[PDB]
Amino acid sequence: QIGKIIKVSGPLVMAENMSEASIQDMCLVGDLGVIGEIIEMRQDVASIQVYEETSGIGPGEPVRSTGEALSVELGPGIISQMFDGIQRPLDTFMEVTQSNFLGRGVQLPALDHEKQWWFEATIEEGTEVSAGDIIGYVDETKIIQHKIMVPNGIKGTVQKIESGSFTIDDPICVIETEQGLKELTMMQKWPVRRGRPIKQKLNPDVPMITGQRVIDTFFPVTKGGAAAVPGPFGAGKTVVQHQIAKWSDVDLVVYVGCGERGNEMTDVVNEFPELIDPNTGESLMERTVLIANTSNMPVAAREASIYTGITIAEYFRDMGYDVAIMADSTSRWAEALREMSGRLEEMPGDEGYPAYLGSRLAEYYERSGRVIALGSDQREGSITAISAVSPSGGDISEPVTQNTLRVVKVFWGLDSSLAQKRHFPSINWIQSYSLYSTEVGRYMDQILQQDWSDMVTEGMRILQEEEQLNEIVRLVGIDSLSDNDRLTLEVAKSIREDYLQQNAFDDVDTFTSREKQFNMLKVILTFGKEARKALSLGAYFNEIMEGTVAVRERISRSKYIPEEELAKISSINEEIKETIQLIVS
């Protein structure tokens, strides 16, 4: 069946003779064949929201339905690829259209259907399998093992399967189902609006090593948890997401950029394939799926970006891997929703955004989490959601930030005043929070067998008391309050400048292993603690730390100590001890 346009008005195009199509079906609209999504339908007439631009399209032009919802192709060839909101490869787009620009009305398959991949079967013929079981694997990269698993909704018995070189379109296995015989390919199509089903969800209690000191110490995020990063103008939220993308114990990374700067996206495309794995494995781009959408892209494609990305994350989570998805930025996504809801004459909720914003954000963030994948293998996967929020003028009271914080548990709020200094992390220790501090404290205390929870509570208490001291300092001076609290200020300065302050685009400061974190925190905390034991035990009012000026430089150097030499900070701590015990007498 073919349709006929009867009305064109901006992104909305109405077309009659669409009785055979269904709602949320993707269609080619007009003579150019632009991609559109069916929202409404009055009798035969259907209202379609066109993704691409609609300039030059009028009535009488035909419309043809694809017959499926938003398509994502999930198979070998998806890693090391740059897609748009609709999962279209940008490199293949450039090479096929022979133009450096994205032409309107061009549709291309997501994965290389003609590329040959080596399939290795790991199951015997005759073993009954349900939806989610693994029948083979392909070594898509040297790090990631792309496991060919059964598409969802197919349950049966394996008829024949054998290893060999095949494409993603060639059948590699036959399944005897209740309906009959069905052949399975190496690529499965899934709708991005509906989340991939699982067996059972569980609490994310395994903390992630992000390599960031301020993150992994005070406000940690677990494998499967959700974190929101709202920052003023240029406080550093995108670079925080970049850091989590490069240094993280996750298996795969899905970086969705929605409505951000084209140059800032090209920076990602440039620096990702030139960074290697922390353990000296392969390139960063060989373990990352990039979904780029310029600020100037089609508003609808920007709306579908996070859904495509989270669907790919669920596809790799169903295999049993740990995936981290980074969104930049969910505020631009919410503004796309605002534009669509305003052009559809829907009842505004708060500040022009649609009232179902909270519901949509809940639907997104609840898809991420540590779950048990479907299948008899009982494998476990996780999706860590890291999202960046762009509040107008940095107002946290904005509905986007409020609705995001209503469903996430990790909040890394950035501060303008802290961004003005070198503290580009700018995570306000007083304002920010993490409900995983309890669970992460338990885990990080048990696997390391150190009193790490007490260390973290003491450091955070020092920073809170420093927030009070920041008030008590005005107009009275340093000499006024007790020398004990003066030392408290110096210890808070030590934490702020040696532990909290962390440059991201540095040679060795960009990564701080777990052992290095504990050792650096030990140096700082034991410096403060030895001074605490000494000060009330006969410390001069002008002589407190003059003899430690040569050893505090070691603390300042702790952030530049290479991770290959692990046992250096332990030599720092003992010297701290020996110096401070004898300066008093």
């Binding site: 009785s19 055979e20 199509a21 269904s22 709602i23 949320q24 079906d25 929202i39 409404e40 339908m41 009055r42 009798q43 919802a69 709708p191 609006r193 509906r194 969800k201 569980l202 609490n203 994310p204 829907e346 009842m347 505004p348 909720g349 708060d350 649609p354 009232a355 179902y356 909270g358 519901s359 809940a362 639907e363 963030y365 609840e366 898809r367 989490g369 009271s397 914080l405 209503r406 469903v407 548990k409 929070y433 409900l435 809170q464």
Partner: protein, 444 residues
Amino acid sequence: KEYRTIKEVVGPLMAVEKVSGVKYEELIEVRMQNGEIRRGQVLEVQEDKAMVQIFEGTSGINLKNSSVRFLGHPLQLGVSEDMIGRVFDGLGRPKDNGPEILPEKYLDINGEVINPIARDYPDEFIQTGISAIDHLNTLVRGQKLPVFGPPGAGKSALAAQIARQATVLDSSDDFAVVFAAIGITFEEAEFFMEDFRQTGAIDRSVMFMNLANDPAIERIATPRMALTAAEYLAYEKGMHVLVIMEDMTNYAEALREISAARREVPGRRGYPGYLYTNLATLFERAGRIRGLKGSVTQIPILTMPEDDKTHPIPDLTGYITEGQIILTRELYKSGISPPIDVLPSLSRLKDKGTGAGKTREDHAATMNQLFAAYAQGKQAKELAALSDIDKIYAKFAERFENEYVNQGFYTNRTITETLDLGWELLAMLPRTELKRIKDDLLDK
């Protein structure tokens, strides 16, 4: 009896043509072309035309090949004594993957309003297990006592603590709890479920779980379903039921979403005008009934915004509820657990709650005096420097807050120990300034 005449589908709304005998708020089933079945509800009916809203959504629906069945009854709930010890969703579907319980009967979830002459005044006492509640803001069987707090303050743990440690000093009838989660994350869901199964309180409780990612229609139906089940177990089986709801602010937000989807005229602050009545129809479902054994006590728990004038949700809730419980994140930072700020917190029915026989003869004397005691104590150290005539009161306030740090959420302080600590710590500097009628109540 199936109608295969869908005329138009606009977003979550669908119009069915050529119908007859369709009523308002009638639930319907949509048989899609692929065989998938979706539930929905009638929102409007004009002649043979009928506008409905689908719960799950409207994705992938072809209007030509789909059909609609009209069941002929509104939102119902199947009630039965086997309901204890099970976990349901917002609409009543089981989530514990347990056996399908045979319902005794189906009841409309909206219920019916109680005749003012048939309502009974609450007079009994519930031992919540918290001293700050059982002695200062006493809970009464049938009293609607809300829990206000900042986002992420001491409320999720307080809900579980009350839901476990709540009991009466009787065995006839046996106590029951109905916990309703409305628009929460899966981690909070599992927090409540795991705590219940760990302490064994799930054996005497009925849980209605509605995740935040659930549809807004189910979020609206969740508290009404919980209160319907509570009314059944109380007014028909003679059980004293304690309902605990969290969170109610999410209910209000989802209701705003509902009215935004139904294109209704938005009232004040973007919320529907009937929000006040829709909240009243849920709060007034508590109380006792003349001639019935059971009782329904309600504890709604809500997030309060800060610096946003006064939100109608806290205002209307605190006005239709007999009292309120205030807590603060400053107290959560100070280690108070449960962090209950007793200065702005007030219970309006504690007078009938306590008495001789009900709790003890001295509880009524201790309550009225502890109010002024902690007031004077805190206002002595920080009004609204150095001095001594009120420093003795200052230290009282400090230890009053510090001894509630070391108790935690796992302390089940009975009424005996509560009154014992009351008089046992009342007597350090005995003074006649305390307004007691006689000295026999000054034995502590």
